Amino acid sequence: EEINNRLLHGDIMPPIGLTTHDFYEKLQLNALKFPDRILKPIMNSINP
């Protein structure tokens, strides 16, 4: 959502070699990855 707010305010500026569409997609793909700590709730529920 913060990336979308930057897009709506025109605060997203792509680097040289990327269009704004490609940079926005790169930001969204990187922002929507699960962290390593997603296994803390999983390993709290299970008995190894």
Question: Distance between CA 15 and CA 23 in Å, rounded?
Answer: 8
Size of residue set near other proteins by CB under 8 A: 16
Nearer to other proteins, 32 or 46 (CB): 32
Contact 23, 15 (CB under 8 A): yes
Instruction: Pick the piece of the chain touching other proteins (CB under 8 A) from 14-22, 26-34, 40-48.
Output: 14-22
Q: Quick check: 1 binds other proteins (CB under 8 A)? A: no
Q: Are 3 and 24 in contact (CB under 8 A)?
A: yes
Question: Contact residues for other proteins (CB under 8 A)?
Answer: 6-8, 10-17, 19-22, 24
